[PDB]
Design a protein around this ligand. Sequence first.
Ligand SMILES: [Mg+2]
Ligand SMILES: [Mg+2]
Ligand SMILES: [Mg+2]
Ligand SMILES: [Mg+2]
Ligand SMILES: [Mg+2]
Ligand SMILES: [Mg+2]
Ligand SMILES: [Mg+2]
Ligand SMILES: [Mg+2]
Ligand SMILES: [Mg+2]
Ligand SMILES: [Mg+2]
Ligand SMILES: [Mg+2]
Ligand SMILES: [Mg+2]
Ligand SMILES: [Mg+2]
Ligand SMILES: [Mg+2]
Ligand SMILES: [Mg+2]
Ligand SMILES: [Mg+2]
Ligand SMILES: [Mg+2]
Ligand SMILES: [Mg+2]
Ligand SMILES: [Mg+2]
Ligand SMILES: [Mg+2]
Ligand SMILES: [Mg+2]
Lengths: 150, 141, 129
Amino acid sequence: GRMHAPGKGLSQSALPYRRSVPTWLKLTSDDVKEQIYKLAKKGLTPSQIGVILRDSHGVAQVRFVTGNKILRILKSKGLAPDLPEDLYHLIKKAVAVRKHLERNRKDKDAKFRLILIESRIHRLARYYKTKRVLPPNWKYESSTASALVA
Amino acid sequence: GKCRGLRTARKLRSHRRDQKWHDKQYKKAHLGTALKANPFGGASHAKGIVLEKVGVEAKQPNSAIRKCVRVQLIKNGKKITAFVPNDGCLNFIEENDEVLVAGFGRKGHAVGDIPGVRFKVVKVANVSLLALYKGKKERPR
Amino acid sequence: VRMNVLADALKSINNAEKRGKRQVLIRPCSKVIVRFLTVMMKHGYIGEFEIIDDHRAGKIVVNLTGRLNKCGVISPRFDVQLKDLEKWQNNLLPSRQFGFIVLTTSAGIMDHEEARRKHTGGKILGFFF
RNA sequence: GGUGACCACGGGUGACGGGGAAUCAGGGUUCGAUUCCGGAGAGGGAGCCUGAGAAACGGCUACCACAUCCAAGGAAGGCAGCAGGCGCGCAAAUUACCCACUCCCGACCCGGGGAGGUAGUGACGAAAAAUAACAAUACAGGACUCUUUCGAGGCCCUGUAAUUGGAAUGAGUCCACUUUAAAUCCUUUAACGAGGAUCCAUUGGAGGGCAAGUCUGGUGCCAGCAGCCGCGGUAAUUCCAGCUCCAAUAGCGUAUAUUAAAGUUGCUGCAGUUAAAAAGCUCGUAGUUGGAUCUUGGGAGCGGGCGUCCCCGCCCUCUCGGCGGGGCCCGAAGCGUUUACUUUGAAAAAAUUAGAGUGUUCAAAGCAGGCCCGAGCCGCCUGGAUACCGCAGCUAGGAAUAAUGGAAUAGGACCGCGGUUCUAUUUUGUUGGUUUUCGGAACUGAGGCCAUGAUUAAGAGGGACGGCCGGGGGCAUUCGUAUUGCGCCGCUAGAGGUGAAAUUCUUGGACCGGCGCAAGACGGACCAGAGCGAAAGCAUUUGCCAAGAAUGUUUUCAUUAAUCAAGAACGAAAGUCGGAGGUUCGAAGACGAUCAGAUACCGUCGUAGUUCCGACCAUAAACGAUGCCGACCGGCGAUGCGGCGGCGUUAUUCCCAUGACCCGCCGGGCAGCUUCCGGGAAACCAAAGUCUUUGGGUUCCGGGGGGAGUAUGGUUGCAAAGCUGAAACUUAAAGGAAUUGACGG
RNA sequence: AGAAGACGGUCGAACUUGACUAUCUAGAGGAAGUAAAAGUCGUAACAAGGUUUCCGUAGGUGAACCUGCGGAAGGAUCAUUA
Ligand SMILES: [Mg+2]
Ligand SMILES: [Mg+2]
Ligand SMILES: [Mg+2]
Ligand SMILES: [Mg+2]
Ligand SMILES: [Mg+2]
Ligand SMILES: [Mg+2]
Ligand SMILES: [Mg+2]
Ligand SMILES: [Mg+2]
Ligand SMILES: [Mg+2]
Ligand SMILES: [Mg+2]
Ligand SMILES: [Mg+2]
Ligand SMILES: [Mg+2]
Ligand SMILES: [Mg+2]
Ligand SMILES: [Mg+2]
Ligand SMILES: [Mg+2]
Ligand SMILES: [Mg+2]
Ligand SMILES: [Mg+2]
Ligand SMILES: [Mg+2]
Ligand SMILES: [Mg+2]
Ligand SMILES: [Mg+2]
Ligand SMILES: [Mg+2]
């Protein structure tokens, strides 16, 4: 079930049992690597690097072809954002909602959604703190959120 | 549903002693209000002095005059009403006698058609009421 | 959420058996589930079963033989010693003639008769009869 | 600084703690003032002397409270020690004898001990056990028997009244003995001691529960009985008695505390739609609970018999191996985590509990006791076990389940080689000097190798991405007729309203019709067992702003999750305050009706409000009277969204898409029909199922009905009130679902 | 060798005031709730109970109750036709 919604959907990807690379995929390991480097230097998150790589160049799974995850490859070279992508979009969503609430203070629904989003931010941040991805004193503040994002 | 976790013993025990206050027997036996309110003060029997002889009407379906006595207890000086449970034992009672008074039989609750009488007379003037009723011994004249 | 794969496996077996079906499919497969099925099958309360291997936690297809009355689980895995294993036998088994309590011991997952035979206690897993 | 929701601190205790006692499926629930161990006190506090040991009290000092004698100048107190008193009470013994036993004290074989022993009172309680047995007559009864009912006796047990009818014993009188410090009791044993064996068995009952009378007299809703149902108003099986029966029995009744009963406190093991009950909804920290995954498989004779059953051996390393150089051997050091868990061992007072032995005359008990004596037996054989003793702590095994770790910007492991500070010791034995690099440890640079090192990606979750979807939310904008009012026009005496009326408006032109204007509300029909939203709730057009479910996904992170005390956001209507606006409707109020009355239902007005903005309030039958997450368990036809397929018809064009239908499939929804899945008290419910075959995780919450959501305290609020929340007392039913009847304007 | 006694210090009973905290209890009068029952007034709930009932809220009335707004069916409708 959804964490903050009364939904029980099932939409998710289903990886094939065959882990072997397709025989028609002519791109080699470092070829997939360098394409990732170009797309990341264009300013792309690992989630949308995998989308464009699976779509245009026909790679099934970056992890299957290159032996490692996209974020593992980006962090190994040293061009991955310190703020994790799933966290970054959460602060960005909260910033947009807070900005909208300032013009519309009678939008009680948006105040409710802001509480849910902020809760997801704080739960995710607590998880990253215990995994040492985030600094121990990394505090998400509603005031300095805008500078923390973008 | 009730928690069955291996480390929930604190919540299970706290919930039990919290919920135990919700039944009458545990509440009256541990709060102490019933003990204070009891004219006998937790005693099976208590002595008193017959203030006067009184008659009490029975409840609605029955029709009789139950023979009782108003008696104040020699300890703590509380005025109560005590039944005289035989055919003619009120005649044995008279003004200003020391009477042993017991509960009527269901723990501070009125019994039968007698309204609001929790007590009954066991002995009067140090001689048993059953002994006087059966003629085994007599009032000291 | 799913917090006891063995509980879901045993409840699925019970429901299919009560329904009378010849086969049952358990979606999450585990080592504990497989061992539990092995001790049941050795005693004869179920038939052969297959472990369908996907790269995730696999599935299991169990051949029900129609001779399983109940295959419940005891979710809080209490510490059962040998001095109080008799109380669990009286509380759980339908009789002293048949029925089995499965408890994981340091010598492996086994029934209570075998656990007593090699003089070892452990955590109670479930029961079947 | 320390301690706290893992409950500190504070309060209460009718709390000395424990060994233990009661109840006894298991689990538990109560009680432990009380003889054993530990503690505390000696009327309440306090301070001291001596002594090894005292903050001693049958030691002192002072004060406080009582209180003793006095010649009034003074003196002397501590029974919660044994007796015995007063008081208090429902509630508890003799102002007895003795160191003989167990021990203790002392300078001590000798003295002392209200410790203790003995006896007295003692129905607390526990064990044993009298109040009668036998024989033969009569009358029944028995499968009785003999002829097959009819009569008797070759048989068996009871019964009723009898010179029966003569045997046995105690309970008592009472000699001696015995015991004992002296006694007493008991055990022996002389002599008496039983035929209403009058040497006298009682306490409660006889409608049901619950064993036992439809007996007789009295009473007559009175007296009374009756724990609960109920009995009693004239032939009462229930009262008062007589008789007869029943129950237990030297014991039975009553009151009250407590245990089982009570699965009516539920961990085992209760419930929450309608009976009592799930918060209006959501977030959320404590708390609790958490997907799968890391050694499996194979072996050698010993082997539950390779006897393919398998006792089972499983086919860590390095240091002297203590039997500076022997193979005949097994000790010193650490764990290639930390725990939890399980098994073993050690240590765990006795009594009590269970339990071994033991004829105490049996038994409760107790820890004793048994064998031979042919009399020299000039003494032998034993026992005084064992189990259990939670939790915590100690020791050694095992490593399944559960938690926790290692190497990720490699400041990673191993193997060696460079790179720096001191130090055990030598003997370069006449001292002195020693080289002592002497051996090892101090910091470190360049390497080789590690298969170099990241489990998978949950029909878990989060996030990204794509197209759509929706009375979802906010802001602005737009339209609609209607209502009311107003301005001009036309003809008329009515209009309005009701069951009938009346109040009210009306030749001043009411109502009606027409053309217009203004205002503030409200968004019909389309509108559905349809959509969205966490609920409350959300419906004119268009735009903007963020948001969201579902579907699609071979995208990304990798456990980030579920429920949640405390805390927090939202929360219909009504209500409160401030400011606008007030069309309609309309609490209050007035009048008119109606009625016996009518403070109403009906009608005409009409205030607050209803509308908007802001600030409060936090409540609804806030309902599905029904927690959330997860798994599983029937069928069928629809419907909303998204997606995937396929005959065909349609839209346009020149083909495909793409829309409108048609036939299916998948997933998520709102629901529906049916079913002997199953459940339930049933109504009914595919959940309210998977429940005595009882345990997926986790919140809230109920405990007969009233009093009562009251009182009081606290807290919130401008108030109204909200949240939290008893007790005394009272009551035998209150309730739920179904059934039949009766009744219905 | 040495008694009374005195200074200072320290324990510190006891007393006075004050504060806080636990219980117990008196009280003119007021306002409830129970029980009794046979009283007066009306008939609010039960049938569409004669205005359907009930919930929250606000106002009003001798009394039960009435009325406004929003809600529920535990209703007197599981249904109302292109
Ligand atoms: Mg005490
Ligand atoms: Mg004690
Ligand atoms: Mg002392
Ligand atoms: Mg001395
Ligand atoms: Mg003293
Ligand atoms: Mg006698
Ligand atoms: Mg009689
Ligand atoms: Mg009981
Ligand atoms: Mg119950
Ligand atoms: Mg209810
Ligand atoms: Mg939490
Ligand atoms: Mg696991
Ligand atoms: Mg008129
Ligand atoms: Mg409102
Ligand atoms: Mg106003
Ligand atoms: Mg009006
Ligand atoms: Mg749960
Ligand atoms: Mg109650
Ligand atoms: Mg007054
Ligand atoms: Mg009414
Ligand atoms: Mg009515």
